Design a protein around this ligand. Structure first.
Ligand SMILES: COc1ccc2c(c1)c(CC(=O)O)c(C)n2C(=O)c1ccc(Cl)cc1
Ligand SMILES: COc1ccc2c(c1)c(CC(=O)O)c(C)n2C(=O)c1ccc(Cl)cc1
Ligand SMILES: CCCCC1C(=O)N(c2ccccc2)N(c2ccccc2)C1=O
Ligand SMILES: CCCCCCCCCCCCCC(=O)O
Ligand SMILES: CCCCCCCCCCCCCC(=O)O
Ligand SMILES: CCCCCCCCCCCCCC(=O)O
Ligand SMILES: CCCCCCCCCCCCCC(=O)O
Ligand SMILES: CCCCCCCCCCCCCC(=O)O
Ligand SMILES: CCCCCCCCCCCCCC(=O)O
Length: 582
């Protein structure tokens, strides 16, 4: 109460406090060495303990923003290292804090972080767990200044858990490696979603966010009253608006409040918030944001009652348009947890466009009478794609499914670079393996979650190295139109084939020692180049070539003087293949 530092220290706990303070400093002073930050953390922690012992001790009354800023301005090489940022220190709070936010660089120039060999890690881990973990916490945090700290803390613990379980295993690598790769992706996805959610808010505006949230919060809490959901969407919008601005403290308090509000009213929101609400102040938010959907009420009316058959439709709509559309969304979303949020938005958009026409016409009811028929094809498009694509993935495996997508998209946008096409298709493939395992009722929400990040990543690259107007149309298109726009792309009739290049199709024995992962990316790269050269090739033609290449390899890696083989049969394969594809 009287001392903020003392208060947070007591809430968080020493360990958590020390880690958060470290992350906080690493995100601002992204250039200072690790031992320098460690020094700061200790100084702040010691200060904190003083305040815990006596809330009236010097400076214990200062605000976290103030203490933090002062400490920051302490750094002697502040001007020589961060130049312009040092001028913030001449300002008074809150301009000082505001000034610091502005100079935090989003994408700093730091070397890629390379993964050491399992044995060095595990020994480092054992020989000095604290510094090994904090050292990486530091390296990761300085590279993602915008990654919400507590979230970064949750990942660290997932990492600690992996080293503990695996560094004792019989086959460390067999245990750890796959774990590290899983965490990396989750970390990447989490980072992407965060940037995405804020970028989306800037572009599309508050209304669109509120809509997306109404739909999402309604699928998850089907039993809550519309007024509660509204209350929540309202507060949730402030929270995200604030958290995007970047101030960790402000963000942290807004989220905490929201979580407490939710827990106090849990029995009037959802029956699934029990476990989450018991957890520590530091984990509540995270938990709730991931809670599973509650059971939807058994006795639920027909949507057509209040939205198609009622006589006061246009009257209720004209009176408060967005509120009316929100109720529609609410009602429609909580009966369809199986729908993707964006799909629900499309229906809402459709119902809106209809009421706008119909309520201005002679006899409204007559005009908007069959709107639910409008929805049918809208709902079906995403459903057929899932069925069709999961079936294909069922037959072929992940890898072969990835090759299928490779041929499919190269033909649609041959202008894209081969490395980019490879990454996209591979990740598209992963989405297929990760979601197709789910029961049909949960597939769509799954694909949407994963596809959103992949589509955004694809758009960002392209944004930097523009290549196709079509991709640009889809990338800058409506939030709700993005995926449909890509789905609508057709083979590029215009495209002009790339001239043959012997090199591009020559292979060496080294391919035999390449890691399974790199072997594929090598074959898949050739495949893309193959299509870019012979775009009019049919599935039959291609499949045959791919079959030869397949054999080609297995054969040359299981024979003496491998080198000769590849260069000898290579002439043959390539010569025959060119002939078959005219
Ligand atoms: C070359 O392939 C990658 C891919 C993703 C990567 C990194 C390197 C690095 C390392 C680097 O920046 O060089 C980081 C930090 N990545 C993340 O996005 C991330 C974020 C949060 C967590 Cl918890 C874990 C991972
Ligand atoms: C509970 O309320 C929300 C609100 C926005 C959301 C999400 C959930 C989720 C999570 C989910 O879909 O369950 C994602 C991925 N959001 C966005 O990226 C986003 C951000 C801004 C706009 Cl304008 C539109 C969409
Ligand atoms: C743009 C992504 C939104 C994710 C998110 C979420 O689902 N909940 C959320 C969950 C249920 C009701 C309302 C919001 N809160 C959340 C906010 C503060 C504290 C705890 C959870 C979130 O930030
Ligand atoms: C998330 C904070 C805890 C840090 C633990 C990370 C230890 C593993 C080091 C490898 C990280 C580089 C990312 C990768 O390519 O795997
Ligand atoms: C500078 C010392 C204070 C450390 C700053 C970090 C404070 C974070 C408070 C943790 C609250 C969890 C919020 C949430 O649920 O997301
Ligand atoms: C508080 C409830 C507000 C809900 C407003 C409903 C709007 C539905 C249209 C979907 C918005 C996507 C943006 C668009 O393309 O128009
Ligand atoms: C497997 C990969 C293909 C997934 C099918 C796309 C379905 C997209 C659902 C999201 C949306 O409604 O736009
Ligand atoms: C560049 C490659 C384009 C990738 C398009 C992904 C769209 C996924 C939806 C599936 C589909 O309809 O094809
Ligand atoms: C001009 C024709 C050159 C022939 C080169 C064929 C390269 C395509 C790579 C085929 C890899 C398919 C993957 C697999 O076999 O599993």
């Amino acid at each position: 109460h009287k001392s903020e530092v003392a208060h947070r220290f007591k809430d968080l706990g020493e360990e958590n406090f020390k880690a958060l303070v470290l992350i906080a400093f690493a995100q601002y002073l992204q250039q200072c060495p690790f031992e320098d930050h460690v020094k700061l953390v200790n100084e702040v922690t010691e200060f904190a303990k003083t305040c815990v012992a006596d809330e009236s001790a010097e400076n214990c009354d200062k605000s976290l923003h103030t203490l933090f800023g002062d400490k920051l301005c302490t750094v002697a090489t502040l001007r020589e290292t961060y130049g312009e940022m040092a001028d913030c220190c001449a300002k008074q709070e809150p301009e000082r804090n505001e000034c610091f936010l502005q100079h935090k660089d989003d994408n700093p120039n730091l070397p890629r972080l390379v993964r050491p060999e399992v044995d060095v890690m595990c020994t480092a881990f054992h020989d000095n767990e604290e510094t090994f973990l904090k050292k990486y916490l530091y390296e990761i945090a300085r590279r993602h200044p915008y990654f919400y700290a507590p979230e970064l803390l949750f990942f660290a613990k997932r990492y600690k858990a992996a080293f503990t379980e695996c560094c004792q295993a019989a086959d460390k690598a067999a245990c750890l490696l796959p774990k590290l790769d899983e965490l990396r992706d989750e970390g990447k996805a989490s980072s992407a979603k965060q940037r995405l959610k804020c970028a989306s808010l800037q572009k599309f505006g508050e209304r669109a966010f509120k809509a997306w949230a109404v739909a999402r919060l309604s699928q998850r809490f089907p039993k809550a009253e519309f007024a509660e959901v509204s209350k929540l969407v309202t507060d949730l919008t402030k929270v995200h608006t604030e958290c995007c601005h970047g101030d960790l403290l402000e963000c942290a308090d807004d989220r905490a409040d929201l979580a407490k509000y939710i827990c106090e009213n849990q029995d009037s929101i959802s029956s699934k918030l029990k476990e989450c609400c018991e957890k520590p102040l530091l984990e509540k938010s995270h938990c709730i944001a991931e809670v599973e959907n509650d059971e939807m009420p058994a006795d639920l009316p027909s949507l057509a009652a209040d939205f198609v058959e009622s006589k006061d439709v246009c009257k209720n709509y004209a009176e408060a348009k967005d509120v009316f559309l929100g109720m529609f969304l609410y009602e429609y979303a909580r009966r369809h947890p199986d729908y993707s949020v964006v799909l629900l938005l499309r229906l809402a958009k459709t119902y809106e466009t209809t009421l706008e026409k119909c309520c201005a016409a002679a006899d409204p009811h007559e005009c908007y009478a069959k709107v639910f028929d409008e929805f049918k094809p809208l709902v079906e498009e995403p459903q057929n794609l899932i069925k069709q694509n999961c079936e294909l993935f069922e037959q072929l495996g992940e890898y072969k499914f990835q090759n299928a997508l490779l041929v499919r998209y190269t033909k649609k946008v041959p202008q894209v670079s081969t490395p980019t096409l490879v990454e996209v298709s591979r990740n598209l493939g992963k989405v297929g393996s990760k979601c197709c395992k789910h029961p049909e009722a949960k597939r769509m929400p799954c694909a949407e979650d994963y596809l959103s990040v992949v589509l955004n990543q694809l758009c960002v690259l392209h944004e930097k190295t523009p290549v196709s107007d079509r991709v640009t149309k889809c990338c800058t298109e409506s939030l709700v139109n993005r995926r449909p726009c890509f789905s609508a792309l057709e083979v590029d009739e215009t495209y002009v084939p790339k001239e043959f290049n012997a090199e591009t199709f020559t292979f060496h024995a080294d391919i035999c020692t390449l890691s399974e992962k790199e072997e594929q990316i090598k074959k898949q790269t050739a495949l893309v180049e193959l299509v870019k050269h012979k775009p009019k090739a049919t599935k039959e033609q291609l499949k045959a070539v791919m079959d030869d290449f397949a054999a080609f390899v297995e054969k040359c890696c299981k024979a003496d003087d491998k080198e000769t083989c590849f260069a000898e049969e290579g002439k043959k394969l390539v010569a025959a293949s060119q002939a078959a594809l005219g």
